[PDB]
């Protein structure tokens, strides 16, 4: 029996009567390019994508954030052409390019990159680690405003904080310095949250470093509702990603639901839901910045368990499921002598009635 | 058939699962290694705009790798 094809089968638009005049696959690289763009395209038949590909809804994610400024593409393109034409006109780049001795300042490229198109890439990184799906249950934004944070270790050196960095708790035991490039008249807000830090329930976040009503870049007079307490990544719990996020407070708002006393290290008070928190307080403002890092267990984590948090430290551990074995059969055949050892519980011997 | 999604291959061209779960069959594109000359030169003879497919078995991992369990509250 045969059935017609539901959709248009491949290699159908082509014609077989004309075969020699057609242009051939010159190289392996041309084939895989055709194969790859074919793969990203959809197909009606059952494929690898519809089994192990996240099940994103067809509707685009909602993001009422800061739109881009209206840059004049005409003048912007002309200024770009002014830069490359004088670059090619220079004399020293010819030798340096063809002798392979040139380089580039990394931090300078980083500085101009994060101002030009960084927030789109940081948005891409955010959804990869799962910041948006865990925070807003899918809704996204674009952190247009840059954001730099550092942990002052001693006085000479410091640990930076950017998207996807590891941070030690010993260096994160104090408060960090923050800069977010705003002089801009109105207020701002900042908060530090841990997504997977909670242990009693999923989709619950803690809060370690909250500041509100910060006029301008200066951070000192910004009042704190939730005072500082470092995180506590337990041994064996794995890795916990700590998230910076920042909003554009257009006008001052009170904090009654959110107001907390002197720190007192009560996780029942520290825990809440960012989803409902955004729906109540943040209807006047919108996201402006974002960053995050990762933390792990260390000696200072053990210190705060016994001394600061006033509780016993937990000790988790990853346990795999047991190795599967089939149902026993009292007369095996063509199996090694250790068929019994695969099912015996006690490795030691024992004698029943003697 | 051809492997995929935690399905190894023996020297006698037999397919075998590597993870515990459900088996699935699909059809995807086939790109050989450069050392497979008979398959490499084949796709060069093909015309651009046309692509060949092949069957692929796929095992869906049912359970996760494990679970984090409390060992001691000290």
């Amino acid at each position: 029996r045969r059935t017609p094809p539901l959709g248009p089968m491949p290699n159908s638009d082509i014609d077989l009567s004309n075969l020699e005049r057609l242009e051939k696959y010159r190289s392996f690289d041309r084939y895989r390019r055709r194969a790859e763009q074919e793969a990203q395209a959809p197909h009606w038949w059952r494929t690898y994508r519809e089994y192990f590909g996240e099940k994103t809804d067809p509707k685009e994610k909602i993001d009422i954030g800061l739109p881009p400024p209206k840059v004049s593409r005409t003048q912007q393109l002309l200024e770009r052409k002014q830069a490359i034409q004088e670059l090619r006109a220079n004399v020293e780049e010819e030798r340096a390019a063809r002798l392979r001795t040139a380089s580039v300042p990394l931090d300078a490229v980083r500085a101009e990159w994060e101002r030009t198109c960084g927030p789109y890439h940081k948005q891409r990184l955010a959804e990869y680690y799962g910041l948006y799906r865990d925070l807003f249950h899918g809704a996204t934004f674009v952190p247009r405003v840059p954001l730099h944070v550092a942990y002052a270790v001693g006085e000479d050196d410091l640990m930076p904080v950017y998207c996807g960095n590891e941070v030690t708790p010993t260096e994160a035991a104090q408060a960090p310095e923050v800069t977010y490039e705003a002089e801009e008249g109105s207020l701002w807000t900042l908060l530090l949250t841990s997504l997977d830090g909670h242990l009693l329930e999923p989709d619950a976040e803690y809060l370690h470093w909250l500041l509100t009503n910060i006029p301008g870049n200066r951070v000192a007079e910004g009042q704190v509702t939730c005072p500082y307490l470092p995180p506590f990544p337990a041994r064996g719990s794995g890795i916990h990603r700590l998230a910076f996020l920042l909003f554009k407070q257009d006008q001052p708002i009170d904090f009654s639901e959110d107001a907390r006393p002197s720190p007192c290290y009560q996780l029942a008070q520290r825990t809440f839901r960012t989803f409902d928190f955004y729906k109540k307080h943040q209807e006047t403002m919108t996201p402006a910045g974002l960053s995050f890092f990762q933390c792990r267990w260390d000696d200072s984590v053990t210190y705060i368990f016994h001394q600061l948090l006033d509780m016993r430290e937990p000790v988790f551990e990853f346990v795999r499921p047991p190795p599967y074995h089939p149902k026993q059969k009292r007369f095996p055949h063509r199996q090694p002598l250790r068929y019994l050892d695969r099912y015996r519980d006690s490795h030691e011997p024992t004698y029943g009635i003697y | 058939w051809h492997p995929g999604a935690h399905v190894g291959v023996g020297k006698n061209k037999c397919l075998y699962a590597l993870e515990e779960g459900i088996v699935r069959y699909t059809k995807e594109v086939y790109v050989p290694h450069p050392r497979n000359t008979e398959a490499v030169d084949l796709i060069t003879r093909l015309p651009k705009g046309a692509v060949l497919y092949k069957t692929f078995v796929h095992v869906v991992p049912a359970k996760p790798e494990g679970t984090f369990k409390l060992v001691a509250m000290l």
């Binding site: 029996r1 059935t3 089968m9 082509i14 077989l16 | 093909l46």
Partner: peptide, 19 residues
């Protein structure tokens, strides 16, 4: 499989030169 609409998707000999 033959009865299914996906039949004839993997065949490739009808493109290349026959010899």
């Amino acid at each position: 499989y033959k009865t299914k609409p996906t039949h004839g998707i993997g065949k490739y000999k009808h493109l290349i030169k026959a010899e």
